[PDB]
Structures are given as structure tokens and as C-alpha cells.
Amino acid sequence: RGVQMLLTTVGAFAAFSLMTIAVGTDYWLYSRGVCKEVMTHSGLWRTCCLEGNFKGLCKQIDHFAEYFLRAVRASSIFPILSVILLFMGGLCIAASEFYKTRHNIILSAGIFFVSAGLSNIIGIIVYISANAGNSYSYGWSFYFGALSFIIAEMVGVLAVHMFIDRHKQLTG
Amino acid sequence: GISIMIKKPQKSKPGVFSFLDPLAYEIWMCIVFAYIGVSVVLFLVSRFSPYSESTNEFGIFNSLWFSLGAFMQQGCDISPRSLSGRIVGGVWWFFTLIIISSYTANLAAFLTVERMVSPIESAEDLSKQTEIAYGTLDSGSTKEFFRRSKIAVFDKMWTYMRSAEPSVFVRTTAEGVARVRKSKGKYAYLLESTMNEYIE
Amino acid sequence: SESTNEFGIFNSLWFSLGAFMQQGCDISPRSLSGRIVGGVWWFFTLIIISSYTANLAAFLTVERMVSPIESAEDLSKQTEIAYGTLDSGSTKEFF
Amino acid sequence: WFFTLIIISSYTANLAAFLTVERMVSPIESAEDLSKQTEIAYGTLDSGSTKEFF
Amino acid sequence: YDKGECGAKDSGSKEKTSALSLSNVAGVFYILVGGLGLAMLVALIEFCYKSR
Numbered sequence: 001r002g003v004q005m006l007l008t009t010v011g012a013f014a015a016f017s018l019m020t021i022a023v024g025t026d027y028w029l030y031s032r033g034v035c036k037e038v039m040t041h042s043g044l045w046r047t048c049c050l051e052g053n054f055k056g057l058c059k060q061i062d063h064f065a066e067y068f069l070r071a072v073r074a075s076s077i078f079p080i081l082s083v084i085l086l087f088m089g090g091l092c093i094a095a096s097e098f099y100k101t102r103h104n105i106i107l108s109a110g111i112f113f114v115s116a117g118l119s120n121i122i123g124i125i126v127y128i129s130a131n132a133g134n135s136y137s138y139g140w141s142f143y144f145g146a147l148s149f150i151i152a153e154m155v156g157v158l159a160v161h162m163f164i165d166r167h168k169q170l171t172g
Numbered sequence: 173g174i175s176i177m178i179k180k181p182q183k184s185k186p187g188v189f190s191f192l193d194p195l196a197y198e199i200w201m202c203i204v205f206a207y208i209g210v211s212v213v214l215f216l217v218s219r220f221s222p223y224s225e226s227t228n229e230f231g232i233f234n235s236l237w238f239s240l241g242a243f244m245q246q247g248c249d250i251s252p253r254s255l256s257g258r259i260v261g262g263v264w265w266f267f268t269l270i271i272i273s274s275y276t277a278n279l280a281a282f283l284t285v286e287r288m289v290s291p292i293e294s295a296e297d298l299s300k301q302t303e304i305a306y307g308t309l310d311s312g313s314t315k316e317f318f319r320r321s322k323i324a325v326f327d328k329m330w331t332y333m334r335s336a337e338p339s340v341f342v343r344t345t346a347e348g349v350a351r352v353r354k355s356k357g358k359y360a361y362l363l364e365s366t367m368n369e370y371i372e
Numbered sequence: 373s374e375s376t377n378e379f380g381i382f383n384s385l386w387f388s389l390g391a392f393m394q395q396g397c398d399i400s401p402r403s404l405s406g407r408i409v410g411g412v413w414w415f416f417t418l419i420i421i422s423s424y425t426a427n428l429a430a431f432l433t434v435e436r437m438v439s440p441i442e443s444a445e446d447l448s449k450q451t452e453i454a455y456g457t458l459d460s461g462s463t464k465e466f467f
Numbered sequence: 468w469f470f471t472l473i474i475i476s477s478y479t480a481n482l483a484a485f486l487t488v489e490r491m492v493s494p495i496e497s498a499e500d501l502s503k504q505t506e507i508a509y510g511t512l513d514s515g516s517t518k519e520f521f
Numbered sequence: 522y523d524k525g526e527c528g529a530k531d532s533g534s535k536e537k538t539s540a541l542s543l544s545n546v547a548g549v550f551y552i553l554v555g556g557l558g559l560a561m562l563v564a565l566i567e568f569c570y571k572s573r
Contacts (some may be wrong), residue, residue: 110216114561149205157232171221191419195540260556264553271546278538283427288434429483433484
């Protein structure tokens with residue numbers, strides 16, 4: 001009991017709000033490259049150059065068994081899936097006005113936080129293993145996604161313990 | 173006698189964390205994520221409705237502890253008894269079974285090839301690791317001496333020196349030793365032994 | 373006020389010894405402190421015995437071992453290996 | 468416990484030996500590997516053209 | 522060959538390997554995430570198949 005019932009919303013908000021940076025900004029990776037060689041960084045859809053004549057220039061980036069793995073890497077779906085899962089978990093924890101005090105939705109809410117978690121393990125490993133296909137280093141959007149994963153793993157357990165407090169404690 | 177000079181090879185100075193070096197940073201970073209990831213599901217499944225908590229001791233804290241011992245091959249005080257509880261344990265072991273075996277395999281790599289090296293010796297060795305370059309003082313007696321000799325071990329050395337580029341000849345001994353100091357390995361120089369053990 | 377576990381000095385020694393071996397721990401240090409205490413001593417054992425099992429390959433696969441007396445001079449400065457000369461000749465006079 | 472801890476480890480090590488030595492050796496080739504070393508002997512048809520040729 | 526410009530019969534060097542990469546071990550990580558997702562499938566049955 002206590003206030004901790006409400007901190008679910010703070011945990012969810014923090015878990016969700018970070019993710020938007022990942023699904024498009026170019027700060028995933030530092031390397032040399034081209035905007036056609038020059039210091040470069042690249043997003044999923046685009047690429048930009050720095051410290052040269054192309055400083056501030058940008059271009060599209062593209063990829064068109066390994067064929068299916070290339071397709072999965074280029075569609076990058078796990079970001080979107082985890083985003084939808086986190087959002088639907090937030091919409092679940094909001095459910096104060098139906099199933100009142102049974103809160104079957106609050107029971108279900110853990111599924112989203114877990115699945116959004118497990119999503120990003122595959123997402124990361126696909127992203128890294130394909131991009132590796134040496135001075136290079138990982139850009140901060142990778143750390144942002146990892147941090148979002150950390151808070152998602154926090155809030156899932158927290159929310160499940162809060163369902164245990166609010167309802168399961170009454171069932172014995 | 174005609175004698176050989178090379179750069180002193182320096183000595184090993186391991187970094188204190190070098191015990192990680194056989195295995196890549198990404199591996200550890202993925203291990204840590206897996207070690208977290210396995211705990212949350214193992215908990216959540218273990219406290220679905222018995223309908224009583226003595227039905228399943230495997231709460232959050234215990235669902236952490238169980239994973240650590242399983243990752244270290246040190247077992248447990250308790251193990252799950254549900255089907256959906258057990259299956260994760262029935263998977264998590266295999267990951268450790270692979271990865272520690274790979275870590276041992278790579279730990280054998282450096283400890284082998286390294287003890288497989290040998291140095292330069294006897295001048296004859298410069299027939300084989302030929303990418304460590306060598307040459308002579310220019311226009312001096314030794315340069316013509318290599319041309320005039322006709323024994324195969326020297327015939328190779330001459331045949332190389334007669335064609336190598338960039339220039340394998342130096343105007344002075346000072347330029348030679350400077351060149352050896354500059355390349356810091358990968359280069360070797362020729363002169364009379366009386367000068368050699370003087371520079372030494 | 374942690375007042376539940378069975379542990380004691382000789383039991384802690386016993387738990388330790390197996391924790392340098394690999395037979396399963398037969399008692400539980402059940403506390404967050406005790407869990408942390410295990411959660412590194414395990415890893416330490418797992419590292420070291422792996423390194424030993426790696427290094428025990430080298431001696432079995434790349435023999436060479438130069439040893440007896442490297443300089444042929446410094447054997448002068450010891451008293452186990454004997455040395456001497458042919459007699460009745462200039463080699464003695466040199467010394 | 469210690470007896471097992473040694474013996475299984477020392478055994479595993481040995482297994483490497485063959486699985487490594489039998490990959491590091493390979494056959495004689497292109498006359499040069501017949502003449503670098505003479506663990507296997509050879510000669511010619513005697514007084515024939517090839518003997519004088521060598 | 523005497524004006525050849527490449528290494529011959531042999532060039533063996535055995536560089537210090539850059540260790541084993543993630544791309545080698547990934548085949549474990551996939552089946553791990555598979556098994557973890559698969560556990561929830563039976564979790565959403567074993568204690569609620571009697572529900573309505």
C-alpha cells in the first residue's frame with residue numbers, strides 16, 4: 001500500500017518517453033563514411049557527414065538467409081513493436097474506471113512491459129550483428145534505448161507487485 | 173665479421189584488465205542483458221494464481237538468486253516445479269554451457285600461437301620472414317661482396333636487394349641506425365661486427 | 373537482527389571449500405549480503421579453473437625448452453656443473 | 468573433490484594434442500618438400516638420363 | 522618470379538585475433554529469447570484454462 005500505487009504512472013512515463021530518439025536520429029554510430037571519405041554518422045533512414053566539405057550535408061541510406069536478415073534489419077520492426085507495447089501498457093495502467101477493483105487490465109498490464117523488454121534484446125542483437133557486417137564506437141541513442149529497457153524492466157516488476165498489493169493480497 | 177643489427181624488441185606490459193581480452197566487450201554487454209531478461213519472466217510465471225504462497229517460493233528476490241547460481245554452475249537451494257516455470261531453467265543452462273566453453277577455447281588461442289614464435293637468428297632466418305626488410309650500406313665493400321658471392325643463401329639476399337623498392341641503401345651508418353630507430357622493428361641493417369658491438 | 377539462518381564458523385568454512393570446488397552448495401547463505409558474497413567468489417573460481425585448463429595445453433603441444441647454460445660464460449659462476457681442460461697443452465697455459 | 472578437479476582438467480587438455488598436431492602436419496609437395504628434409508628417402512633409375520640430368 | 526611482386530608458397534603470420542564476435546554466438550541468444558517468449562505462451566494457459 002501507500003503512494004507506490006501511483007508511482008506506476010511515473011515509471012511508465014519514463015519508460016516510454018525516451019524511445020522516440022531511437023527510431024530515426026542518426027546518432028547510432030560514429031565512423032568514417034561518405035555523403036556521396038569523411039567522418040560520418042548514420043540513422044536507419046538517412047546519413048550525415050561532419051568535419052569536412054560535406055559538414056552538415058545529409059543523404060538517404062538504404063539496403064536495396066541473408067536476404068531475410070537484410071529485410072528484417074531494414075524494416076527494424078522491434079522499435080515500433082516495443083513502442084506500441086509500452087504505450088498499450090500505459091493505457092492499461094490508466095484503467096481506473098472499468099473492472100473497478102477487479103482491475104483485470106491491471107493484471108494484464110505486465111504482459112506489455114515484459115514483451116517490450118524481450119523485443120529489444122533481439123532488436124539490439126540484429127542491429128549490432130548486421131551493422132558489424134577499429135576506432136568505431138556506439139552513439140548515445142544506443143544508450144538511450146538501453147536505459148529505456150532498464151526502466152521498462154523496473155516498471156514491469158513494480159506494476160506486477162502493485163497488482164499483487166491491490167488485488168492478489170485480497171485473494172489469498 | 174659481417175654482422176646484423178636489429179631493434180631491441182621491448183617487453184610485455186599487460187593491462188590489468190587483460191583477462192577480458194580473449195572475449196569481446198559486446199559479449200559481456202549482451203550477457204548482462206540476458207541475465208536481467210531471464211529473471212522477470214521466471215518470476216512472473218512463478219506467481220500466477222494457485223487458486224497459498226507456499227505453493228511457489230520463487231518470488232522476485234528468489235527469482236533473481238536462482239539465476240545467478242545457474243549462471244555460475246553452482247546450482248541452487250530451490251528450483252521451480254511448474255511446467256512453465258521449469259522450461260526457462262531448461263533453457264538458461266545451455267547458454268552458459270556454450271559461452272564458457274567458447275571462453276576457454278579462446279583462452280587457449282593466445283596461450284598457444286604466442287609460445288609458437290622464435291626470433292632471428294643466424295642470418296639464414298631472413299630467407300623466410302622476408303617482410304622484415306633489410307639492406308646494406310651503399311657503395312661500400314659489403315654491397316659488392318653480396319653481388320660477387322654465389323652461394324644460394326646469399327644469392328637470395330642479393331636477388332632481393334638487387335630489386336627491392338623503396339631504396340634499401342643508405343649513405344651513412346648514421347642514416348642506417350637512424351632508419352632502424354625510425355621503423356622500430358620491421359627493418360634490419362648490415363655492417364661490420366666491430367661497429368655493431370660498439371653501437372650496442 | 374538478521375536472526376534466521378543456520379550458519380556458523382565451521383559451516384562457513386565448509387560452504388567455502390565446496391565453493392572453491394564445484395559440488396553443489398548444501399546450505400543457503402540466504403541474505404542479500406550472503407548472496408553478494410557468493411556472487412563473486414563463484415565467478416572467481418570459474419575464471420581461475422578455466423585459465424588453468426587453458427594453460428595446461430601449452431606444455432602438451434609446443435615443446436622446445438632451451439635451458440642448460442645460455443652464455444657458456446656464466447657457468448663459471450656456479451659450483452654444481454664441473455668444468456676443466458685437456459692437459460699437456462697450451463689450453464692450460466692460457467688460463 | 469580436488470582429485471576430480473585435477474584429473475578431468477588434465478585429461479581434457481591432452482585431447483587437444485591430436486586434434487591439433489594432426490591438423491598442423493600435411494603431405495610432401497612439389498619436390499621442394501621432398502628435399503628440404505629427408506625423413507623419406509629417394510633416388511633415381513640408375514645411370515639413366517635423369518641421374519646425369521640432376 | 523625474380524621480378525614477382527607478391528608472396529610465394531607461404532606467408533604465414535598468425536595475427537593476434539580480434540577475439541570471437543557477437544555474430545558467432547548469436548545462435549544461442551536467439552533460441553534463448555525464443556524459449557523465454559515460449560514460456561509465457563504456456564503461462565497464459567496452465568493457471569487459467571478453466572477461466573471463462
